[PDB]
Symmetry: D3
């Protein structure tokens, strides 16, 4: 009855990525991210986690057009694992029955024009990209996988700028600004991470 699309431990949160919403996560804490179908089943999923481990906090809970999304976090890695396990047990699913990440698009725009940069910035928010910087774009599905890609990219290239991360919808989208080599190091690494993630076929 409950199909799990994404089930992932994101360990050791980087500080930029830490920024529908509930309690906000902080740098160094750990997260469990779950995407499911049908969307409304996510309400049973969150009760399963919160009643097993009172010490974890909900950061995202949203019922989208098709899918249901959840993020929970804690300072203790042991606590998040245990919440993940209660979800798997209460729904009769396994971790490797999730969908495998499917890459939809990626590219590097070097030396973004100023007119491109200014319009980019106003239906993003949070961080911004400045004219002259290089831009990496990356699209995947299921959408919630954008989360782990963002965190890993920042990990290996800490000088980069997280411009935007869309984790909810039909597809996930990542925007990263920096020097041409920072964004190349990030792109190469993301591809590796996603290919190594185990799951079934769409």
């Amino acid at each position: 009855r409950t199909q799990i699309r994404v089930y992932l431990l994101v360990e050791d949160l980087q500080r930029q990525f830490a920024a529908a919403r509930g309690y906000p996560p902080y740098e160094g804490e750990h997260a469990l991210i779950v995407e499911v179908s049908p969307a409304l089943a996510i309400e049973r999923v969150i009760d399963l986690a919160l009643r097993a481990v009172p010490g974890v906090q909900p950061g995202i809970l949203y019922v989208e057009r098709q899918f249901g999304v959840l993020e929970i976090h804690s300072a203790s890695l042991d606590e998040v694992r245990r919440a993940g396990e209660a979800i798997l047990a209460g729904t009769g699913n396994r971790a490797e029955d999730q969908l495998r990440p499917r890459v939809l698009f990626h590219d590097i725009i070097t030396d973004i024009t100023d007119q491109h940069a200014v319009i980019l910035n106003r239906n993003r928010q949070a961080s911004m990209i400045l004219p002259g910087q290089s831009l990496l774009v990356y699209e995947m599905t299921p959408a919630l996988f954008a989360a782990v890609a963002a965190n890993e990219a920042e990990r290996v290239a800490p000088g980069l700028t997280v411009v935007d991360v869309q984790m909810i919808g039909a597809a996930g989208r990542l925007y990263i600004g920096g020097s041409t080599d920072e964004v190349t190091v990030a792109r190469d690494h993301i591809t590796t991470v996603l290919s190594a993630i185990e799951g079934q076929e769409h």
Copy 2:
């Protein structure tokens, strides 16, 4: 040409659900409604004109064109008025009531004794009444989405102490959130399942 996804008379509106209702005139307790969902979405503009010009005494409460589908709610104090407006729509589009889709249940569950953290984040993604920690929560998902309308109204009739937390009747799927004692939410769920099964329509 114009396909009817949902076509339903919702008779005798209960007071929580009436208040819960993109928006036009608000319906009131005891009044009657006609709900219609169609494809392609923009056809609903022909549907509302058909109704409003046949029976000038009905009032539009909802009119909206979504990503895929078109939605209309009309209501009146007179049950005969809503009925006749419904017939103008059917005749003017060459459709019949049983040309609609029969309800398909996607999910349902009863979460007892909701934790306080679940209740607090649940209450800020909803905007009407609120659920309190300790209450039991019923969630019910179906498609087409507009059937969520009749499910909410039937639940309140049969269990008037419940709390209508949210009713999502527009989109690819409808979602119902109901709070109360475990026996109130269990009585509502059983009735809803019966009501949706009794409805006549085509196959997805």
Copy 3:
């Protein structure tokens, strides 16, 4: 890799549609290039291709939707817009007729609109408004970005009409036009002709 769904030169913008058009605003008499692509995020490469090939053009729309990506660029010079488009075609390995052919989803003319219909209609809108008693033309098509040319062409052949609403983003495009029964009938007929004449692939 980048699939082009809509690629169109829309030349000589009429003033109602021009203002209707987010980034820099176009003006009456200027020319625009409209592009809808799949997958959505590919549109960022598409706009980069245009702006550095022909710097004199300005972006008016840039948006990443649920499934698709949308771009509008414009300039006073028809040549600058055309040349920017060519850059987009070469850098994605496409040509203009590799786009999707326009598919008509629904159209209708509501004469003598009732007042209850008009007031609730005007509240899901924005800009111009329709008055009780006017006639309403509604027109739906896909891909959505084709709604742009339908709107601009309608205003060209019947400038007295009222542009109520134009939805160019999504799974489907929607056009709302108000005027006399004759203005909108002339508008509806011309829109169908324009759309049939556009060459593209299948669906």
Copy 4:
């Protein structure tokens, strides 16, 4: 320390105004309400606790901190419950009912036979019921803003066929928009003026 700007029992809610009502639980027709406006704005957080802990059976419908002032609405099916919660607020802040400001009328007028262009642009800056071309429109402005609440409810009692188009009860001034026949809107305006004059309070 805590100054009361508005303190009022609104008895027996009429159905249009009840539905019209930052938001918490929705009130229903026939229920009773207590409305309070205070200064400084943040003091209202002490006021709601005072009420909710004295009489657990009342429900908050409105709680909001504005640019200058703080606002609360609580309601119940029991008139005695709203009354007693009101008294807890007065006792716990060292205030009395007549410490409030007496209503000051800023403007009123009756626009007959509204033009269609006025009606169409008027309807998109309002979000509830709508006014139709040809109807007469009453506008009424007062301060403090929260008195708009009692003015709307009194008008509907005395002229039930009217249309409540908008009620702005939060801010520096309250505004009331009412539609109907010229005699319905004239009957409402006369009554409102009497009601506001009869209210006891201090001087601006």
Copy 5:
């Protein structure tokens, strides 16, 4: 009973400025702008104009925290004057009983930094300023006077960029981008226009 704060014919609208809302004005048309107190009296003001001259259209109608605001427009200058006259007659006011414009602030920031430019752009909308351009800011009250200043500024320096115009509130605000001399020509001219406008004292 009805106090008129601003009463002004803005003749021959420039194309940039032509962009709460009703029907949109077009380049070359003419407008009447009215601000009043108490705010709600603006509903009597608009009925007076629309019933006298059916051929004019409402573009702005809004009841703000303190004041009421109206804009109407037409292709015929004769029509707008006539609507203005119906308002004056129906409320027993005179055109020169409005408030005189009071200048609150103005300044020219030359060569705006790129970090300043990018953040400026996201809680504006419509047009944008690019890094390196010069910026003129101008504040006045009553707020509705920002309207005539914007239109006049564009008239004498058509190459300029109208970044934003706030006409509703306690004070009006104008943002203009261009070369340092375009913005200086605009600023000098605005000052002249406002000083020449006749009204009473606050």
Copy 6:
């Protein structure tokens, strides 16, 4: 000409308040300069003064409100922030103590918050949430931008508390803090001390 209402070095940002802070986001441990001025539009000159004097700082808040203008800038270097502030002072002909003295408008501690209060309270909010049974400290002051230092200082002396809401823009500032009755009492006392110690003019 430019009147300074608030001018403050807020050094060593705590992590709840840091995230709470629109433009570039500050991080825990960095330093910020906060400025509230009158008239509102003067703030555009104020920020220009800072960013080109010390380019290494980043703007986090820039807003023109009904009456007043607000600016926040930040950097990892306390010296860069201080030096940017000095540029703001020289270019406007002010000094730090020409600002307004903080005026306390209301404060209170609600113990054992009822559940109906908590759920409706959480719906006019944003970020962190208060749970039924916790104690609530509310604190109101003017000018509003002083709410920033009150929030950051409270978190410094009682890091276990929950920052529910901080309103720094307007006619008045408002602080919402949740925790145990002891955390918030310690927080309330320290806030009053900090505010009394700030030197400025009258009101």
